[PDB]
Design a protein around this ligand. Structure first.
Ligand code: NA
Ligand code: ZN
Ligand code: ZN
Ligand code: ZN
Ligand code: ZN
Lengths: 70, 67
DNA sequence: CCAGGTCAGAGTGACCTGA
DNA sequence: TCAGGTCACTCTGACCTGG
């Protein structure tokens, strides 16, 4: 377990996955996306923060891409 | 026949004091047995988008009078 | 060490069941 | 009629294994 944080949601990172530090959740979520159509119910600017229980599927995927997952 | 006052899907009956669909019925059922909005507490709740933000779906349930 | 797979855990909603 | 239960379906993510 690395002393690093997930660049997507701020949870503890499990490792360096798809080119970014990420948790198992965000790793699998991105994994499943490369194999989807999400719609943000708000304005495409949702906070992704695991500790505060904030997430949005569309904005989660956009943030995965934003921070550099490939 | 009436529409669900929470999401606009077809209503199945009068549940918890509100005309509503089986989805919103069950969702409120589970809530009364905690949700945070990642946006601005104004997320769209409709038959397409209702599953997306739990916090706003519950607030919409309360707004239209589910008890 | 990580990519990709696995499947128990959890939310959904159409349908069930008793008051 | 409705309140509350059911459970197949599906997404989630903790853990595994091979590389
Ligand atoms: Na997914
Ligand atoms: Zn994460
Ligand atoms: Zn969003
Ligand atoms: Zn509804
Ligand atoms: Zn919301």
């Amino acid at each position: 377990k690395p002393k690093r944080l997930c660049q997507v949601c701020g949870d503890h990172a499990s490792g360096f996955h798809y080119g970014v530090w990420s948790c198992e959740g965000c790793k699998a979520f991105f994994k499943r996306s490369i194999q989807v159509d999400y719609v943000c119910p708000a304005t495409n600017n949702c906070t992704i923060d695991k500790h505060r229980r904030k997430s949005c599927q569309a904005c989660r995927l956009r943030k995965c891409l934003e921070v550099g997952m490939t």
